[PDB]
Design a protein around this ligand. Sequence first.
Ligand SMILES: *[C@@H]1O[C@H](CO)[C@@H](O)[C@H](O)[C@H]1NC(C)=O
Ligand SMILES: *[C@@H]1O[C@H](CO)[C@@H](O)[C@H](O)[C@H]1NC(C)=O
Ligand SMILES: *[C@@H]1O[C@H](CO)[C@@H](O)[C@H](O)[C@H]1NC(C)=O
Ligand SMILES: [Ca+2]
Ligand SMILES: [Ca+2]
Ligand SMILES: [Ca+2]
Ligand SMILES: [Ca+2]
Ligand SMILES: [Ca+2]
Ligand SMILES: [Ca+2]
Ligand SMILES: [Ca+2]
Ligand SMILES: [Ca+2]
Ligand SMILES: [Ca+2]
Ligand SMILES: [Ca+2]
Ligand SMILES: [Ca+2]
Ligand SMILES: [Ca+2]
Ligand SMILES: [Cl-]
Ligand SMILES: [Zn+2]
Lengths: 276, 276, 276, 396
Amino acid sequence: QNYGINLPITGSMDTAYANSTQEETFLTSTLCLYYPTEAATEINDNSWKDTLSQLFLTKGWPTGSVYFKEYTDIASFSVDPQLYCDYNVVLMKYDATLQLDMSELADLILNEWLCNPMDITLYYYQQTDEANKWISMGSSCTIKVCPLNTQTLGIGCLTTDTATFEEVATAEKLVITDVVDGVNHKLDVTTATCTIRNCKKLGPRENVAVIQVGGSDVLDITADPTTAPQTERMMRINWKKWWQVFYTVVDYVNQIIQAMSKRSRSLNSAAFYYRI
Amino acid sequence: QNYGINLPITGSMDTAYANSTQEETFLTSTLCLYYPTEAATEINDNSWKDTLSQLFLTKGWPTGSVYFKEYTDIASFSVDPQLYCDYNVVLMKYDATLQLDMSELADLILNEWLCNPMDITLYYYQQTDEANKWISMGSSCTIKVCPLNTQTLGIGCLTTDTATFEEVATAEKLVITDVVDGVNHKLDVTTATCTIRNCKKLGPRENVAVIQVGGSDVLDITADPTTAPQTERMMRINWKKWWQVFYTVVDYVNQIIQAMSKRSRSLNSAAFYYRI
Amino acid sequence: QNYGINLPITGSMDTAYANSTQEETFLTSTLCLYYPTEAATEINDNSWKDTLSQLFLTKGWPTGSVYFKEYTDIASFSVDPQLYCDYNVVLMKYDATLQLDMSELADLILNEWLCNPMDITLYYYQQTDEANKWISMGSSCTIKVCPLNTQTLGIGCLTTDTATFEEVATAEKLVITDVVDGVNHKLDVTTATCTIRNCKKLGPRENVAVIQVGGSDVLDITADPTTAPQTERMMRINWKKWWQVFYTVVDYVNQIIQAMSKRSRSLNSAAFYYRI
Amino acid sequence: MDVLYSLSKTLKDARDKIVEGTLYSNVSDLIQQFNQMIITMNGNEFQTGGIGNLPIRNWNFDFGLLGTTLLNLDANYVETARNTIDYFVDFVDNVCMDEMVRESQRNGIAPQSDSLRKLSGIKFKRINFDNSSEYIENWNLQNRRQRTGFTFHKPNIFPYSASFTLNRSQPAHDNLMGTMWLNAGSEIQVAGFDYSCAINAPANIQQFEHIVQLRRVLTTATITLLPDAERFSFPRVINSADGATTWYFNPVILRPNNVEVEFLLNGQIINTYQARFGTIIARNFDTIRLSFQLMRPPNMTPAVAALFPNAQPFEHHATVGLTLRIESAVCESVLADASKTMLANVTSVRQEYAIPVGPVFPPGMNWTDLITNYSPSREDNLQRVFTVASIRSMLV
Ligand SMILES: *[C@@H]1O[C@H](CO)[C@@H](O)[C@H](O)[C@H]1NC(C)=O
Ligand SMILES: *[C@@H]1O[C@H](CO)[C@@H](O)[C@H](O)[C@H]1NC(C)=O
Ligand SMILES: *[C@@H]1O[C@H](CO)[C@@H](O)[C@H](O)[C@H]1NC(C)=O
Ligand SMILES: [Ca+2]
Ligand SMILES: [Ca+2]
Ligand SMILES: [Ca+2]
Ligand SMILES: [Ca+2]
Ligand SMILES: [Ca+2]
Ligand SMILES: [Ca+2]
Ligand SMILES: [Ca+2]
Ligand SMILES: [Ca+2]
Ligand SMILES: [Ca+2]
Ligand SMILES: [Ca+2]
Ligand SMILES: [Ca+2]
Ligand SMILES: [Ca+2]
Ligand SMILES: [Cl-]
Ligand SMILES: [Zn+2]
């Protein structure tokens, strides 16, 4: 495939449509439903996974295809999220106090990322392009940035005295930092508690859809202030009970998968591609 | 004259636009305004209805054609609201805690529903297609559902023990239940307290507009997660004083009515289709 | 540019060989060396990493491109090893008592495995084809399997009694289970201690080479009894001093890298095939 | 062919000029030619064939000569002439139809029907006179290895093809770069689309190229070139190359940049037009090379900047189009065109009599297949049948 990636593909605009491949897609794929712990707590049933699997089977998914992964909350799930199967549907409970954290998690799991290690103890770092960010995650991230000049002298911050650096995060389980491009920055990070990587946004992630439970349209998966795209994979629903949410997810699974594309799944479940 | 038969219409271009019919409609149609009680409490005037009627008369509506209907809150208004005017405008106050109830009310009044009776004690029920929902209304609806399998046996529930059922509504005054299609469900509902009906969404209801007073775009009048359509009949206004709200409503009644159309289901062309 | 589509390549003879790309690859790529702790213990020097970096720099690798990752022993290294460099060379000490564990580690890192989750509590599992195996990893994996018949009844085992199951692993930190294909197995695994996954062997992993230090040819990276392929990525060296081992590795890094290829999956072309 | 054309021409002249009351001096030479034709054809038995549903017809010629002693033609003379002319015209029409429905893999240029083979004998060569029609003129030139010329208004030179090529694509078909084109009869509507609007392209420019290889060389061609392809300027839902899925096209049209139309002959650039639109002349060419560019506008008003973000999703897709229309041309070979009726006549005759598919032409005389594989044998057969059809159209 690779040697012919840089080759044209020609198609006639009168080629008959193939039959629906949705049945074959379900019979050969695997679905993961990521829900918060409060969902299973409020459902208060131990066999609900079996019921949901049977309902999915009624909807065409063979038994064994659908998987259910639990996460405590948005913050914990953001610590190196793992996307396991072909189709990942993430139910994210909305909280008006965690808009930026929801935005960061959606940005991380709805886009492809190519990350490299950042030895902040040794080297200064730059964000070369608008697609370049610094993604840091772990138990607690606290990132302090000191912009430098051509002579390495910090601007509004002494290089030695970290206390005069500029705070961009505090005790974050995940943060995507965006500094001015072309300026070398000295970084102070709680490396013992969390890891920071220099990442590049390759493009969208088709196998991951995020359903925001309750709330309003608040996700901003792009750092650009002028753009706040609402892609087809960013759903939003209103809720009073979680059984209704899960029935809505099952009943409209065809529509949800339609909003997602195949071949986007990676061998590894990691949220980014790491190069060291 | 030919009722019950769909005859194609074969108009042409260059027929020339007719004059504005807005004045004639205002002369021959009635307008109902639905507002919460707190609106009248804040206005605190015993002649405000008469003044609004006069102001509407400045806009073309004959005196006695505009009606002012009052409701306590959203929950009370969601108790089988009857909208009988030619044009209905519902001033609905926003509440972050009642997002789903707001959405359900809007879905119930902004759309046409063909509803048939449900006897949960006698029959099991399934939702045939994506337009089929279960709408329950009354003093307090508590719906518990037991999905069944092809062996008419409960899935994660016992058909004889309603405690094992799955709760989708609690103390609701209006709830729209969407379950997985093609599955028979046993239903336990507080029939003495409220009534449930099997309802098919025929399409939009054009004579009803909803003006959300304050808040953000939170309404979702479609059960599809992938779709959250904001039709032209859903207005949103930021507010501090109800007098300003009513002055805005009267001053843009032209625009409000333009966003609406005469109820198709309640005119002679709908004779022997469902009503009138 | 055309990702996800396999375009044929139609090269010709007499196109003339290009110059050696070895120097460019060494300049632009990174090399990870994985060695056991006892290697560093026997070397007993605090600058040996720097000396090896310099010696590699004599062979063309820029300084800071060769990394030295350490692992305690094979069992600890078999706990989801993450090999992230462009080229990975694993110095694996031979132990006559750990032949199968060595084989399993090599099979896991010398091959590509597309893994999807397994929920033994919820579903029964079968291995569809000869490329499907069950890979379990963690602190301690104890897997017991109950084959089922077409009547979903255990064969030589009771689905309700796990003591009658058949043990295929015990206290393993990595194990690859091959069961009879086309048979549903109930599984009892120490899910709290280790995780299991349904993994399909896609093919070779080319950026990982394994140098067996001492011993004989005992590796078997294929479950087929009839095949025991010794690929060019499986070196064997007789040793007495670890310094000699590392000098041999650095002096023949040309040969070692020639035996390897850039990971076909981890490059831009594989975009929308599995990664990147 | 020349004898059949001469028969048709003599009959047409007789129908047009032998009219009541006309001076005999208006028709003296015509009457001599007509009488020579009668003398040559008298006593000869002809058969038009039973191929397909075309009926077998037998033709016998025993006619008296037209008179000469009148000064002005009267009713009797005109009726006698009309009777003879009607029989001869029916014969010529049937011979033309018989020849039109026939094809030979080898001697496609040589006559195929028995009647036309008999007319190619020496005894009929005396019937031959003025060969002035364009088709018979080119036929005679082609019998002598001379440069032929057929003038076509809107020649049907491009086989139908509504195709697209993607240079950048993904399974999701949301960041695409490629070209769409329709090559209709005399039309080339091409459009290069970039979904990213050349945000990441070097120099903020995306190059698009379209090559149309004509199956025959066109000369003295007039071409209208316009800077927009209206056919690919509205939203479309388009099948993928394999047909396994559909993708969404939502073009926003930008002015094509660095427009260069090259007209090439045998790989050599004969004509070149840069940034030219309207009427242009391509004097001799067999290949068209349209190169254009989508240039990202460096200065954008807020709405334009809103259309084109710096990254995905791309909801508005930049498109630059060209339209090429050959109004007139000259070709050494026969072609269908918007003005003549030769292809229509041959196809109509073949369809009316249920002529089974032969070894030369495609089934149903489909023009797209015929021009896609316009081989020398097909060229010979097609010129033969088109010349016969032109001869027949003189009378029918
Ligand atoms: C597609 O559907 C058609 C119509 O039902 C059926 O005849 C055909 O076999 C199906 N499969 C393929 C590969 O076309
Ligand atoms: C329509 O409006 C025009 C101009 O507003 C007016 O002159 C005319 O009388 C009205 N009625 C008709 C039937 O045209
Ligand atoms: C390739 O190698 C040859 C001989 O080693 C050298 O002369 C030449 O410059 C190199 N580069 C290219 C592009 O041929
Ligand atoms: Ca955060
Ligand atoms: Ca500072
Ligand atoms: Ca930046
Ligand atoms: Ca933004
Ligand atoms: Ca409610
Ligand atoms: Ca239950
Ligand atoms: Ca339903
Ligand atoms: Ca919705
Ligand atoms: Ca083992
Ligand atoms: Ca047993
Ligand atoms: Ca097996
Ligand atoms: Ca083997
Ligand atoms: Cl024309
Ligand atoms: Zn495609």
